[PDB]
Amino acid sequence: RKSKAELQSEERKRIDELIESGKEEGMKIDLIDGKGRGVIATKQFSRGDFVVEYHGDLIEITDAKKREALYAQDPSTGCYMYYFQYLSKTYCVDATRETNRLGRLINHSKCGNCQTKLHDIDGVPHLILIASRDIAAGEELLYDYGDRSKASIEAHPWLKH
Amino acid sequence: RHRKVLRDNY
């Protein structure tokens, strides 16, 4: 008797509220063997639950390309650009700057426990991670970065797994 | 160097 429209309206509101509040609960940073920092769950997440936003600076593809080239000139700067399609254009969330936000610290796997989704709030796209399966406390959060480039895989063989 | 790319999940 949660009709379709209502289940939809409630889910939209729930997600919007989480994005807007920026509460990043149920997660902690840890050093992960072979990966640098990573994020570990400190509570159970159920399949379909919001985990965290991939928060950063929203930019357009031409600007993103320029930045990517600039960051590449500094070996101390990591790789935090997340490209995606929205309304017939390509955008990028640039999470390169060190902030307190956790989404940018989540590592890669092809057998991860989170899935990235596009969620728009009044015309502004947001990238969010949702649990793809039940996640137990103590598990490292992981999702598929999606970079299948030969050059990327050559430089970072971990992208293949 | 790498990036991240989202693939269609409408």
Domain ranges of chain A: 1-161
Q: Tokens 């890669």, residue?
A: A108
Distance CA A129, CA A116 (A): 5
DSSP track, A16-85: HHHHHH----SEEEEEETTTEEEEEESS-B-TT-EEEE--SEEEEHHHHHHHHHHHHT-TTS---EEEEE
Which amino acid is located at A46 in the chain?
S
The residue of A149, A160, A161 whose CB has the most chain B CBs within 10 angstroms, and thus the best one to mutate to test that interface, is A149
Q: Tokens 């050559």, residue?
A: A154
Residues on chain B touching A75 (C-beta within 8 angstroms): none
H or E element at residue A138? none
Among A144, A145, A143, A141, CA closest to A45: A141
Q: Tokens 């031409």, residue?
A: A62
Relative to beta strand A81-86, strand B4-5 is parallel
Is A146 in Cβ contact with B7 (below 8 Å)?
yes
Question: How many CB atoms sit inside 10 A of residue A80's CB?
Answer: 21
Residues 73-92 on A with a CB inside 8 Å of B are: 79, 81-85
Query: What is the resolution of the experimental data for this entry, in Å?
Result: 1.5
Distance CA A86, CA A119 (A): 10
**Maximum Cα–Cα distance across chain A:** 57
Bridge partners, A81 (sequence order): A94
Bridge partners, A58 (sequence order): A93
Distance CA A70, CA A125 (A): 25
Distance CA A122, CA A125 (A): 8
Distance CA A46, CA A26 (A): 12
Which residues of A belong to the annotated binding site for S-adenosyl-L-methionine? 35-37, 80, 107-108
The answer to whether the CB of A94 falls within 8 A of the CB of A67 is yes
Question: How many CB atoms sit inside 10 A of residue A19's CB?
Answer: 18
Contact status of A116 with chain B (Cβ, < 8 Å): yes
The answer to whether the CB of A36 falls within 8 A of the CB of A86 is no
Token pair of A31 as six digits: 């050093």
The answer to whether domain A1-161 has CATH 1.10.490.10 is no
Four-residue CA torsion sign, A73, A74, A79, A85: negative
Is A115 in Cβ contact with B9 (below 8 Å)?
yes
Question: Solving technique for this entry?
Answer: X-ray
- The per-type count for chain A, helices as H runs and strands as E runs, is 3, 10
Is A155 in Cβ contact with B1 (below 8 Å)?
yes
A-B CB pairs within 8 A amount to 51
Distance CA A5, CA A23 (A): 26
A127 — phi, psi (to 5°)?
-100, 125
Q: Tokens 């480039």, residue?
A: A149
H or E element at residue A157? none
What is the edge-to-edge ordering of all strands in the sheet holding A114-121?
Answer: A50-53, A124-131, A114-121
